[PDB]
Design a protein around this ligand. Structure first.
Ligand code: HEM
Ligand SMILES: Cc1cc(N2CCC[C@@H]2C(=O)NCCc2ccc3c(c2)OCO3)nc(-n2ccnc2)n1
Ligand SMILES: O=S([O-])[O-]
Length: 313
């Protein structure tokens, strides 16, 4: 077999023009090929301008429409994603002129806001600036925008998310004051322009949680977040790399002390979208109505605290 790697790592120099140009040209062709006969003079015009822009600046910028096209195509090129069947239902937020972590934070708040929509979930992606030389990367160190903290008890026990134990400790190491619940929402750990990450609490009113509701099992205090958002992948398109491009959909669906009726009832009763038969038909219908090496592609990355060179720990 000759599978490709699903990971795209860091750089420390711009992509060499001899690599970038061919990829850029191929994407431009893919994009204008989305008409099948229309816009041959526009195609050639754009090919010439991109090639001149690359040769004069060392890189190039996508138009808004090309970016939107690229995020949707990357989505339908995601083999594992079940939601990609209705891939035209994606809202794009262009944050490519973002310069600071504070600004990153505000963009992310807007995303969570729009996407959550009081439970009537909407799919969205926010695209931050593309990699330049690889030393000014924008990154979210989170794996998800919303995820619970994980604590290892003085027993060797796991309290919270058993999968975030390492990231939670890194937040503490960065100044985040550890509460010790099993449902603590991790802060946003945001890197702008290649600099050390800054910690931002997520305003709690922005976090919609499904409180699970027999009758005594709500006494357990079982709870989960409504918005599944992937924070850590890199969007590749036409030779360009976007190391920060958080996106979301909605959900598909060990001290037990096993029916999923509690979750099924809690989500659906609290009007939080999930991928049931109603939503599947409704969303595919909206999708269909919108019709009036893989690339682009979402890559995995190397966890940034393993590769980051700290300016001033
Ligand atoms: C609209 C509702 C959506 C649903 C129901 C959905 C569902 C899924 C599911 C079930 C998986 C695999 C989960 C697992 O086993 O870990 C997945 C993976 C993924 N989804 Fe979605 N998704 C949605 C929206 C999105 C959006 C908006 C994007 C991107 C623009 C997207 C991109 C991906 C990617 C990149 C993966 C990872 C593929 C891999 O692991 O190789 N999804 N999604
Ligand atoms: C919070 C989250 C996690 C996630 N995962 C994919 C890589 C592994 C990670 C994960 O732990 N997945 C298991 C939980 C899960 C299952 C089904 C589903 C999910 C997450 O999002 C929508 O559909 N994917 C997504 N996702 C959102 C849209 N597409 C994928 N969100
Ligand atoms: O744009 S897709 O729906 O043809």
């Amino acid at each position: 077999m000759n599978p490709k790697s699903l990971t795209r790592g860091p750089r420390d120099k711009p992509t060499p023009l001899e690599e970038l140009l061919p990829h850029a040209i191929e994407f431009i062709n893919q994009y204008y090929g989305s008409f099948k006969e229309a816009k041959i003079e526009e195609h050639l015009a754009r090919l010439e301008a991109v090639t001149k822009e690359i040769e004069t600046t060392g890189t190039y910028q996508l138009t808004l429409d090309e970016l939107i096209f690229a995020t949707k195509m990357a989505w339908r090129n995601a083999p594992r994603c079940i939601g990609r069947i209705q891939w035209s239902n994606l809202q794009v937020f262009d944050a490519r002129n973002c310069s600071t972590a504070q600004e990153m934070f505000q963009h992310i708040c807007r995303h969570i806001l729009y996407a959550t929509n009081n439970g009537n979930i909407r799919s969205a992606i926010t695209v931050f600036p593309q990699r330049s030389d690889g030393k000014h990367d924008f990154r979210l160190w989170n794996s998800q925008l919303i995820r619970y903290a994980g604590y290892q008890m003085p027993d060797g026990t796991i309290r919270g998310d058993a999968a975030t134990l390492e990231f939670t400790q890194l937040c503490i190491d960065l100044g985040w004051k550890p509460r010790y619940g099993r449902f603590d929402v991790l802060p946003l750990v945001l890197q702008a322009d290649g600099q050390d990450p800054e910690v931002f609490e997520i305003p709690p009113d922005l976090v919609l949680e499904v409180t699970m509701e027999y009758e005594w099992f709500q006494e357990l205090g079982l709870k989960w977040y409504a918005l599944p958002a992937v924070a850590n992948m890199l969007l590749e398109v036409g030779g360009l790399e976007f190391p920060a491009c958080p996106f979301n959909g909605w959900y598909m669906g060990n001290i037990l002390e096993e029916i999923n009726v509690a979750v099924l009832h809690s989500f659906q009763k609290q009007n939080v979208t999930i991928m049931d038969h109603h939503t599947a038909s409704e969303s595919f219908m909206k999708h269909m109505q919108n019709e009036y090496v893989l690339s682009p592609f979402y890559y995995y990355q190397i966890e940034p605290w393993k590769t980051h060179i700290w300016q001033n720990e």
